[PDB]
Design an enzyme around this catalytic site. Structure first.
Site, PDB file in Angstrom:
ATOM      1  N   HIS A  91      42.711  -0.738   8.521  1.00  0.00           N
ATOM      2  CA  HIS A  91      41.892  -1.991   9.127  1.00  0.00           C
ATOM      3  C   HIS A  91      41.176  -0.553   9.826  1.00  0.00           C
ATOM      4  O   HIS A  91      41.033  -1.274  10.767  1.00  0.00           O
ATOM      5  CB  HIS A  91      43.496  -2.590  10.245  1.00  0.00           C
ATOM      6  CG  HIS A  91      43.861  -3.842   9.163  1.00  0.00           C
ATOM      7  ND1 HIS A  91      44.962  -4.020  10.430  1.00  0.00           N
ATOM      8  CD2 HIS A  91      44.172  -4.041   8.908  1.00  0.00           C
ATOM      9  CE1 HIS A  91      45.811  -4.623   9.381  1.00  0.00           C
ATOM     10  NE2 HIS A  91      45.244  -4.878   8.648  1.00  0.00           N
ATOM     11  N   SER A  92      40.755  -0.046   9.261  1.00  0.00           N
ATOM     12  CA  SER A  92      39.904   1.294   9.613  1.00  0.00           C
ATOM     13  C   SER A  92      38.254   0.434  10.611  1.00  0.00           C
ATOM     14  O   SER A  92      38.106  -0.517   9.482  1.00  0.00           O
ATOM     15  CB  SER A  92      39.167   1.783   8.913  1.00  0.00           C
ATOM     16  OG  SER A  92      40.495   3.127   8.331  1.00  0.00           O
TER      17      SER A  92
END
Ligand SMILES: Cc1cc2nc3c(=O)[nH]c(=O)nc-3n(C[C@H](O)[C@H](O)[C@H](O)COP(=O)(O)OP(=O)(O)OC[C@H]3O[C@@H](n4cnc5c(N)ncnc54)[C@H](O)[C@@H]3O)c2cc1C
Ligand SMILES: Cc1cc2nc3c(=O)[nH]c(=O)nc-3n(C[C@H](O)[C@H](O)[C@H](O)COP(=O)(O)OP(=O)(O)OC[C@H]3O[C@@H](n4cnc5c(N)ncnc54)[C@H](O)[C@@H]3O)c2cc1C
Lengths: 637, 646
Positions: free
Chosen positions: B560-561
């Site tokens: 979920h960068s």
């Protein structure tokens, strides 16, 4: 939320119609369905019809049924404690049942003796629910309702074989034995299966998931056991308290969550479930509630009284190895199961699994002659109940293309079972709670055979269904183990498998044809030529059958009559509009409300009560029911 | 041939990149737009479009090439000396071609908290509905019904899903029809998937936005297997084009083979949180000290390029289950005829097929009580007051049941498993990514930064205990996998109980070895009893310290960068305008999750699409284009524009 308009308690046939119709009729009306068991939506162990049998397994895996065992042993059953299951899943019986499309006869509804409930009165509601997808020669069925009804994907060669035999003992053929008039005739037996999709015709996908896919006013809580209805100070049902399905809290502590009701609380929790909710709410027998530390809201002694079912007996017969049956599928043979699972996925419309394998049967009624040999106690029921009631049948009889019995107790080979049940029994039972706690098993009594009038018809049925069995092409013998204990020398004594059939089962077996132990008298091989005469029976043989009835008679899951609809002085629980006496805003609408039995498998009935209750509630809220109902998932219309 | 010049160039074909290129090309058939993607073309590939094989895309096995692996340049004292591995997508569709396909949506306040006009929740609410084709019941009007991206409960929900809900009820997490209603911080649902109810196919962004348009128009150009090196600039810092190199560095002499493609109107960068900063840096847009040391001529001095790397922080609590339970383990193992049975099922009837799921069929977002807040320490309480206190729509931890192990089965005993997949919604910890050379093939410096803020330990610790209590109440539960659980003192009452004897014997009925105490490697669980009363595991300070170790040892990315090109003012280290313009340049935008200035409490596929939808609107108006609704019809889908059944 915490608050809605109508609360339906229990997600059975009746409950699914009430919740679904009302929520569709008016999108303003917020209705919530609370169901004890699990959600059934898109579960291949519901929607595939052929796997129905397993939902009655006490194997400690099956979570789709609660099992109600008698509290104490019964003399009438020769010492056994009767078991009565019922559904623990959204859909109720409709998710797990045999899917036999039967209907009551016309008089059954007239004998409710209640305005709004004639055959004449209900006929249009009957047509409203049905989606009839098979031919007939009458005008008596509906063709744009939610519930799809058919002969299913494939009829088993034994169906017509059963019919040929019924003809030979003087039962006439008809296109439709479910035309509200017939009491003595034989048919190809239809199912609650969609002729087109192969899918089971459950109430939840028909009435509830249909509506939930198109609108936002229908709420659903599954895995939620409704403890009790919450009451006002003037006895107006205000709300409803439910607990978790499992009792798996910290320290087993109770965890009630409350949901409140602006307009209506509906109890659709089944013949066994509903009286329990009323009783622990404070609505039942005053003597019982006092002792249980329950304040009396209303004093109703008939709550949980007058348990009516149908009385099943299972005569089992061995058939030829070339015969197509369910036994190898039921034993769980690997590539038998792979074949039928694959055949259903590719071609639901022709698949074997798109059937209940109960493909033929009859309703029957005795002769002037036959009535003479059925004893005094039954003749008193006949003169009173049946005599001048020509549309009422006395016994049910069908052919299952396979054994409906634990195969862990059955020899190898192919079977068919004759599935019989008593239509209007005189016997009666009861169910009362033993606590405020909604996790303790209640007091229970089947009441099976406590009236002596119920033996003579079942005995008659054994001899009749057997005369059919013996006259079939597929018939090879009677499974001695599962039959009456006749005297070995009586002409009525059983004759088990013949040697030709035996040898076919174990072609390299060393035991086949060993006489040692004399455990069976084998049949003579099949001769298509054979002339056949009826089995004579003695008073001895007739005791033997009775004894066999008392040891092997069971529930048919056709449970009714615990919140009866009749005047309060007689013992009844509800108005003609199904209002629980001496409360406001509370109705019981499910098979609990039947004051008198029906001559039918009771999915058609529970639906019809559900349609009627929706009519009554809708005109009480000034709401108008839409026709047709919302489009039903996975269906062509 | 292909063009040497176009109007708009989108660098990177992820969710965001795919929305942009698609929406614009459909908005004006004269507008010439080129999508350049480093990975491969994902079109009609059965290892993309089947939802059931998703697990494989994270295999580091010498074969798999749908992911680039970025490793920490230096060991982390915070993880107990371990170098952290963060993968991202290396394929058209980006993460939408290879992710878990879990349908999740941010909470309303997340968007409000960007503190930038045009990015309020009620500002973005219509764009949220524009992208969705919601194919399940729910009791609200938060969703859309004629967007490209199909969302459903998939083909078949697993029996453990409703079991998990029963257990979550038993510990006071309430059931809800829809936990993705921008409103819910505490509750449990049946978890939907980016899977098309009717076709059983993966709802990836490439087919929904790009391939749809390329089928009906000639103006959308696709160039796959093309790593974007750098942005070409004017003398006035106008972006005039892009230079790309082959995916595989396999040229004569190991040399740099740059092709140039020019842009008349706009260069968009959509190469992801990890990719975009590198393309900016090696173009001359980033920290001046770094660019001066690397010999790159400075275009725009932005120190926050490749700073404030955020993520969600995952922990995987693995539990053993009954052998009659339905799980994915045997399929993940590669048991030939289980794989064969499931591949065939999906072919014949995708609308009911087990493969048309991700098997992650239930979960919860969870918020601790005042009761529980005391357990969590001073540095997490300071965060709570600062961030969560009067923000009631923000959850602390996410939790979902996987119906199988999500772990190397090579390291797992035989039997069946489930994992409590858990992640931290809004971490305090921050990381960074900077390039090391001008060459587009050398690995960059990297720092996950996981757990470099002690506040992050406590909520994950609370997750372990909370999901463990959920495990212990399930019908399918048969023990903890001791080996993959925290190192409790064996005498502790928090110590793991492994598989019971009756379940063990079922695994190996003719095994000679089942029941041998010798080694005392596991404390067996007592057999399943339906009746059993359960009470919560008690814990001590020493147990807590065990779990903090387990978290440092076994915490990972949730893919979920976000946050490497933050959208906030330049003087606060921001990289972009409120229109996603890169400060100090013209005709250059970032539109991917790099822009986010703060985290979102969700699985970020929804959020990456929303930023793409917003980026399309921003570019459209800059070019005087009106975006068409609905979008071009999507390959293999049926013709739909409101709530319906199947
Ligand atoms: C195995 C089986 C075979 C059958 N055979 C046939 C057949 O061949 N043909 C045919 O037409 N019909 C058949 N039936 C009969 C028919 O299905 C039932 O009579 C009919 O379902 C009655 O519907 P009901 O709503 O009145 O009760 P039910 O169907 O039993 O539904 C009651 C529901 O309420 C729920 N409930 C109970 N307590 C609570 C609580 N405290 N809170 C919330 N929910 C609760 C239960 O979980 C259940 O789902 C059979 C039934 C069964 C079970
Ligand atoms: C295994 C996995 C599981 C996840 N689980 C979920 C989930 O369950 N539910 C959910 O909603 N979301 C999930 N996510 C998160 C979600 O997929 C991502 O947040 C989303 O894909 C991010 O979109 P993006 O455009 O910001 O970047 P990306 O999706 O990463 O796309 C970036 C693209 O840019 C390309 N690229 C990079 N550098 C260059 C370059 N120099 N030149 C050209 N192209 C380049 C890459 O090949 C890639 O295709 C997961 C992601 C993964 C990988």
């Amino acid at each position: 939320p915490e608050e809605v308009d109508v609360i339906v308690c229990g997600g059975g046939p009746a409950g699914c119609v009430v919740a679904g119709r009302l929520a569709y009729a008016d999108p303003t009306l917020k209705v919530m369905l609370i169901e004890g068991g699990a959600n059934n939506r898109d579960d291949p162990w519901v929607y595939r019809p052929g796997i129905y049998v397993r939902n009655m397994q006490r194997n400690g895996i099956n979570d789709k049924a609660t099992f109600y065992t008698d509290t104490m042993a019964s003399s009438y059953l020769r010492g056994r404690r009767s078991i009565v299951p019922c559904a623990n899943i959204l859909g109720g019986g409709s998710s797990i049942n045999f899917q036999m499309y039967t209907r009551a006869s016309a008089s059954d509804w007239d004998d409710f003796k209640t305005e709004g409930w004639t055959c004449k009165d209900l006929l249009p509601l009957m047509k409203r629910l049905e989606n009839y997808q098979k031919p007939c020669n009458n005008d008596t069925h509906g063709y744009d309702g939610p519930i799809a009804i058919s002969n299913g994907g494939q009829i088993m060669p034994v169906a017509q074989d059963f019919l040929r035999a019924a003809h030979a003992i003087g039962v006439p053929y008809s296109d439709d034995i479910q035309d509200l008039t017939t009491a003595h005739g034989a048919e190809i037996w239809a199912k609650y299966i969609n002729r087109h999709t192969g899918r089971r015709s459950d109430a939840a996908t028909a009435y509830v998931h249909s509506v939930m896919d198109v609108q936002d006013n229908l709420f659903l809580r599954c895995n939620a056991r409704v403890s009790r209805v919450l009451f006002d100070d003037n006895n107006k049902a205000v709300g409803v308290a439910y607990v978790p399905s499992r009792n798996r809290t910290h320290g087993g502590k109770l965890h009630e969550t409350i949901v409140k009701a602006r307009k209506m609380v509906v109890l659709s929790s089944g013949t066994l479930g509903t009286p329990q909710i009323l009783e622990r709410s404070g609505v039942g027998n005053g003597e019982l509630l006092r002792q249980l530390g329950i304040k009396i809201v209303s004093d109703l002694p008939g709550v949980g009284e007058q348990y009516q079912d149908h009385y099943t007996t299972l005569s089992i017969y061995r058939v030829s190895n070339e015969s197509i049956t369910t036994d190898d599928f039921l034993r769980g043979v690997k590539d038998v199961q792979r074949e039928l699972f694959t055949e259903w996925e590719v071609s639901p419309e022709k698949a074997r699994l798109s059937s209940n394998a109960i493909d033929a049967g009859f309703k029957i009624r005795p002769t002037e002659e036959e009535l003479k040999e059925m004893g005094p106690e039954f003749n008193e029921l006949w003169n009173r109940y049946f005599k001048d009631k020509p549309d009422k049948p006395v016994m049910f009889g069908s052919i299952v293309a396979g054994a409906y019995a634990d195969h862990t107790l059955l020899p190898p080979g192919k079977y068919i079972t004759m599935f019989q049940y008593l239509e209007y029994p005189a016997s009666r039972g009861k169910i009362h709670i033993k606590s405020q706690n909604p996790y303790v098993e209640p007091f229970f009594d089947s009441g099976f055979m406590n009236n002596k009038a119920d033996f003579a018809p079942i005995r008659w049925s054994y001899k009749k269904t057997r005369e059919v069995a013996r006259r079939m092409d597929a018939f090879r013998g009677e499974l001695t183990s599962h039959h009456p204990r006749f005297h070995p020398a009586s002409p009525a004594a059983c004759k088990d498998i013949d040697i030709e059939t035996a040898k076919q089962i174990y072609p390299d077996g060393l035991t086949v044809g060993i006489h040692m132990g004399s455990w069976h008298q084998p049949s003579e091989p099949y001769k298509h030529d054979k002339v056949i005469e009826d089995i004579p029976y003695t008073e001895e043989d007739d005791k033997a059958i009775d004894d066999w009835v008392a040891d092997h008679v069971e529930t048919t899951w056709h449970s009714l009559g615990t919140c009866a609809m009749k005047p309060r002085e007689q013992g009844g629980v509800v108005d003609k509009r199904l209002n629980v006496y001496g409360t406001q805003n509370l109705k019981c609408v499910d098979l609990s409300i039947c004051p008198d039995n029906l001559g039918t498998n009771t999915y058609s009935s529970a639906l019809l009560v559900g349609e009627k209750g929706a009519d009554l509630i809708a005109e009480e809220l000034g709401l108008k029911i839409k026709t047709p109902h919302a489009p039903v998932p996975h269906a062509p219309v």
